[model samples]
Target: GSMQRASRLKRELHMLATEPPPGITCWQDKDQMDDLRAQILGGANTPYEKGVFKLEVIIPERYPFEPPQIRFLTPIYHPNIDSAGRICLDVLKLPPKGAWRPSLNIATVLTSIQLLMSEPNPDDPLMADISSEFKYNKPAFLKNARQWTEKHARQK
Candidate 1:
């Protein structure tokens, strides 16, 4: 599926160049997993302040019909994100019919990710244990999230 995937990726790239979304940056690296970097600006209640988070998006052959696989490269302390930096945003999930418009671009996806940082759903979390702990211990959750931001997402 390499050729098909590459065709879809190229199509998306052309679309992105023509109509890009806000607060997202994309670059293709011949080396290192093609290095498509997306920078998401922080939203409300998130430990992020003028912060930027980078992600690696892997697109399969199916394109817009199927969601791209994404992983956060930076360490973020959130119930929706795991130790390996996998995110648990509903839109990226298979079920619940998350929004996926044919007109949607990479920028929108990245923006959605930023929004997820602002509002966390502990009840239906990716890291179930972390979510439970965060719900039960708000103070501790805040502390760790702040620390992670300071170390990983904070602006210099």
Candidate 2:
């Protein structure tokens, strides 16, 4: 209905055409860019390093206005991510929350996730127990992330 949304979509598309974000690759549906998938190659000294994290993006109409619905297709144990493959971060990106705007793109999401994978959002807990682990048994929290990544974050 609005080319405004389509334009931002193509801009993100072109971003990858020249230089995709570091360790991130986005795949947009050629069928009018209705759906997208961005793969994040886990980076740095983190336990998830070398693990491949798959993120699916399906933006609602009138967005880039609201944050897109995102889920990590590859399951992992994190303070914010639920076992259901979603990083239940509402305070930052979700519509009924703070800080989401048209400026962010699929690249931003993926890039943000790279850091998020390492340093989680504890203030806003998604899986309550996981946040508790992050606060108390910090080592074991990282252990679970490392273990789960090896199990679920494999490239397909």
Candidate 3:
């Protein structure tokens, strides 16, 4: 086990458990510090407004040097997120391919994902059909997003 990774993740976990950011709640598995689950509230004024989204975060042994693997556990209708829940965000990618830095924390990642719900980037999309609809058929995109949120992401 890498002491550096453990130390950093410990600090992050403490902060997250104590003072999570608005619209997000995160916790790790009881038996493993490497696996985490997060609940993200959709941003206001967006198609996904009031929706509760779930995510899975996995910290690697080489974390800090490598980006954590995060995927959407709750399906969302977004151009940047694929059907399999893989995200296409530059900040989530490692150097050379993207711009993830060691200084970045889990709070930052969660907030970034939340922001994407409000302002989608159709130009750089993971789902081609969604991107096309978002760009060419704005109303349809919002309608579909709302339907998906109501059908799958609504909090009971």
RMSD of each: 3.4, 2.1, 1.1
> After aligning candidate 1 to the native by TM-score, how far in Å is the CA of 114 from where it should be?
0.9
| All candidates in order of TM-score, best leading | 3, 2, 1
lDDT of each: 0.70, 0.77, 0.89
Native-to-model Cα distance after best TM-score fit, residue 71 in candidate 2, in Å: 0.6
Residue pairs with colliding backbones in model 3 are none
For candidate 3, write residues 4-98 as lDDT tens digits. 88889889999999999999998986767789999899888888988899999998788887787899999999999998889988778898977
* Winner by lDDT between candidate 3 and candidate 1: 3
Kindly give the stretch of ten consecutive residues in candidate 1 with the minimal lDDT sum. Answer: 26-35
Question: Estimated TM-score per prediction?
Answer: 0.75, 0.88, 0.96
Alpha-carbon runs more than 4 Å astray in model 3: none
Candidate 3, residue 90: Cα displacement in angstroms equals: 0.8
Winner by lDDT: 3
Q: How close is candidate 2 to the true structure, as a TM-score?
A: 0.88
User: Lowest-lDDT window of 10 residues in candidate 2?
Assistant: 88-97
